[PDB]
Design a binder for this molecule. Sequence first.
Ligand code: MJ0
Ligand code: MJ0
Ligand code: CL
Ligand code: NA
Lengths: 302, 301
Amino acid sequence: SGFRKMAFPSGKVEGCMVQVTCGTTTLNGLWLDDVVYCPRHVICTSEDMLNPNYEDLLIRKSNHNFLVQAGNVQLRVIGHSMQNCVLKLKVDTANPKTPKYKFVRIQPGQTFSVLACYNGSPSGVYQCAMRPNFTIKGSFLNGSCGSVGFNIDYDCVSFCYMHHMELPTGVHAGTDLEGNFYGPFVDRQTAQAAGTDTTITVNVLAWLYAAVINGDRWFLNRFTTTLNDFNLVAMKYNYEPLTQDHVDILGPLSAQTGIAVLDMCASLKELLQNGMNGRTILGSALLEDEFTPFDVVRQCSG
Amino acid sequence: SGFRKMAFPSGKVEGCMVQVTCGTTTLNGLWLDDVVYCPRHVICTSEDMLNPNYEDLLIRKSNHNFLVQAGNVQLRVIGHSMQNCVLKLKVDTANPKTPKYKFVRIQPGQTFSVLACYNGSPSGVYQCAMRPNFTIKGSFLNGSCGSVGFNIDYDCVSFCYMHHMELPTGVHAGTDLEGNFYGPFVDRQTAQAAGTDTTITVNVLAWLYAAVINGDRWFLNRFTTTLNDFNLVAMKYNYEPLTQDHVDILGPLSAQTGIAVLDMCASLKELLQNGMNGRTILGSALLEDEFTPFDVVRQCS
Ligand SMILES: *[C@](O)(C(=O)NC)[C@H](C[C@@H]1CCNC1=O)NC(=O)[C@H](CC1CC1)n1cccc(NC(=O)CCc2ccccc2)c1=O
Ligand SMILES: *[C@](O)(C(=O)NC)[C@H](C[C@@H]1CCNC1=O)NC(=O)[C@H](CC1CC1)n1cccc(NC(=O)CCc2ccccc2)c1=O
Ligand SMILES: [Cl-]
Ligand code: NA
């Protein structure tokens, strides 16, 4: 038993990480088949950052302006293509380490794993949620851009995130692997607002289920609640409202523990209104909202 | 910026993970060169588990009893050697994915990454600290035995831990790769005590430093304390006493932040003496002691 923030093993993705250099700027790219994917701002000087015209800036570049290094070997860039906020460099070699893979767009409240890289070398791996405001609380220094987030489904790597920038609050923003931002963000050096973050209620309920599986039972009451009653309490503590769909998702955990989703909602209800009375839950003094029901099932059952 | 529990990438160690079967028991092994290491209780049936004579139990086994599998491939076991609490199965083939590696015995206080496996398939990676009472707060289901813990220095993999068992309190216990148990534990199904854990003081300071680098400033104070003054309040709140070596190890974070180690020791005296009152440092309402000074550096420069 036990319970940690756990990430998918990084192997299949370590094999796709390369270094991309354009003049002064070097950052990380994703080499799959004969394409390398990286953020388009690789072309920007720090002058360009304030207010780039990526169209004009890319016309100034030719394939030979792009240095791609796979470990100790360079890959000749033959083509290049701007797709929204990513750059696709067509290269003369196909990644023989290319896994079975997918590009997906994750939803708020869903988690993925981040392979944090620098100069095309994997440095560290960790688990993130896409916040309801389409930001991530990651760990990125300069040189980490084009690091990716991913899930594995046995054989298949799902690529969902590429890291582009850090916002004034210290939270991070990136794109899907077709180069569209999550949220109202642009690849430019200007102060950008994220908006009010909210707690991922369905994930918090999942965490409380993980707590009971691991034998923290003190916060359980014999009470139940309706979805509407829970929700008008919840709104008040800035909690994402809970739909029938969120209940159907929590179902398998209901069943592993024999506690109905709505009895657990009554338990959450009481925690927001009473607040933990200096007790802990999975040795935490606050409620955790970055574990999906899938995360909890993956770990507390497989 | 930002600050996360980070694990080393698992690619190198994923290459070395195999499934080992003895009769009915199946678990994870580490395959380096032409040798697979695994926990020895692989030879046990669940009655044996209660009080095993590993010597007489191993005697009954021959190489053919030992099914080893690398994905779909069967490796021919051609020799077996019990070393403390690990089995060394010698096989006909060198792992061609064997990284540069060492076997190390980490100290209490130090972190490593865990690659959790089932049926010789990696499933997840997480970061642990070795507790002062030689337990780990792992995440381990049945099948995870033979899961290994490690650090990476550039290209070289330091193997430090192999998973054997869960204690009555929910924490986990294992061996180095010479199969000596971390702590006063044996591979018997019998209730065993870890006894009093303590807070790793040097880690709390490094984490306080991680906080300042990230702009959690609020707990900084005009004051500075002495080691002796600091340690008197440490003894009380069940913290490991602080030594010159600990100050010396915190030096580089001192350099990065411009905050003397004993200025920061005074923010901590403060916090233990007044609790946090439910205020948050890097959005934790409790003090974190599972980040080393090297882990904060590695991640904050
Ligand atoms: C990547 O491009 C990279 O890793 N290699 C170059 C970086 C990674 C960043 C920087 C540190 N942490 C990260 O996550 N990305 C950037 O530097 C972006 C590029 C922009 C999309 C075009 N970037 C550029 C300039 C400024 C910022 N952010 C900040 O300066 C902090 C927020 C802020 C606050 C006040 C006013 C403006 C901006 C940035 O992220
Ligand atoms: C491995 O043998 C394995 O993965 N094999 C398939 C497991 C790993 C376990 C599974 C659950 N969590 C883990 O860490 N290890 C064991 O099953 C050990 C083997 C014995 C050392 C030789 N093991 C066997 C029996 C019992 C336990 N522990 C418990 O039952 C919990 C603690 C407890 C409580 C009260 C009284 C006694 C023990 C065990 O870890
Ligand atoms: Cl906490
Ligand atoms: Na916490």
